[PDB]
Structure 1
Amino acid sequence: MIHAVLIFNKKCQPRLVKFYTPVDLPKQKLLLEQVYELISQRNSDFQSSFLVTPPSLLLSNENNNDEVNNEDIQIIYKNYATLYFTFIVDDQESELAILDLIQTFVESLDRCFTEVNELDLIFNWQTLESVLEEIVQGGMVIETNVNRIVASVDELNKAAESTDSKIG
């Protein structure tokens, strides 16, 4: 179970976080921040993509890759051109499921928002979210297929268009 996803821009501002379960928000954040930081410390080539951490590296600083952990929480990072995506999962969701869901998410985002900028993501955050949700639901990513994901996003855009000032 993904308990949460976070999409940050280059300037570290999160832009989307989804939490499928409740968890205490003050804890969720702390996690998001630590992850943000570590991201900055990691190099562009590293950008780490992940930061698994024993909790104790939660953060501990001493070897600066001290990773981040919080015990039972694995953090997966993915840098893309200017956005960063971080997924926090519980120990019971398999890493692969998490990675795939990420890689799929990202690929989808790039496919849908080919130029994503922070403004475009923002504006179309509702779309980004929908994508994430759909991917998740019933615990299930139900369309996995990068081609559908790309379409589904369009299906949603069709709705928001019919409403647009409550939207745009």
Structure 2
Amino acid sequence: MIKAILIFNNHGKPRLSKFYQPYSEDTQQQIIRETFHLVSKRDENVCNFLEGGLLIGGSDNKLIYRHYATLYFVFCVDSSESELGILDLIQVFVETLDKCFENVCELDLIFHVDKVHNILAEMVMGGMVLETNMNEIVTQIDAQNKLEKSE
């Protein structure tokens, strides 16, 4: 379903990139720059529901994006999906980020991207949304943190 998740600044520098459909490295960065062009130039009043890219394998897919300040949050997903539902999942994922990082910021994406990736994994794997109960996922994240601290 979800093909890739890309997080990047206003200058195209990455902040979180996760892929699920197979793609070589160079294809990955080409998709990244493509998405940066397709999204970053959009105005803040442009609909968040954009068509998918071509390097990903077909425009049938969709590029669901939400941006703030200088940060852009795009989830590369295929055609048969719930753009509105994807957006709700993005919102709850950001809320989970807030719950787990205590007001997450860009600095956390820079230095703590490992735990952000962990949160995303507990959210979604291989294009599959694992959890939509935000309390439940933060409970898992705290449980893994407790296991790490204990031993």
Q: TM (normalized to structure 2)?
A: 0.75
Query: Cα RMSD between the aligned structures?
Result: 3.0
Q: Aligned pair in 2 of structure 1 residues 113, 37: CA closer, same or farther (>3 Å)?
A: farther
What is the Cα deviation at residue 116 of structure 1? 3.0
Q: Aligned pair in 2 of structure 1 residues 34, 46: CA closer, same or farther (>3 Å)?
A: farther
Unaligned runs of 5+ in 2: none
What is the Cα deviation at residue 107 of structure 1? 2.1
What is the Cα deviation at residue 146 of structure 1? 1.7
In the other structure, the counterpart of 1:66 is none
What is the Cα deviation at residue 71 of structure 1? 1.3
Q: Where in structure 2 are the equivalents of 1:31-70 lying within 5 Å?
A: 31-43=31-43, 45-46=44-45, 49-52=48-51, 70=58
Distance 2:84 2:13 in 1: 26
Q: What SS does structure 2 have at the residue aligned with 1:105?
A: helix
Unaligned runs of 5+ in 1: 59-68, 164-168
In the other structure, the counterpart of 1:76 is 64
In the other structure, the counterpart of 1:18 is 18
Aligned-partner residue type, residue 21 of structure 2 = T
Distance 1:71 1:116 in 2: 33
What is the Cα deviation at residue 91 of structure 1? 2.2
What is the Cα deviation at residue 22 of structure 1? 0.8
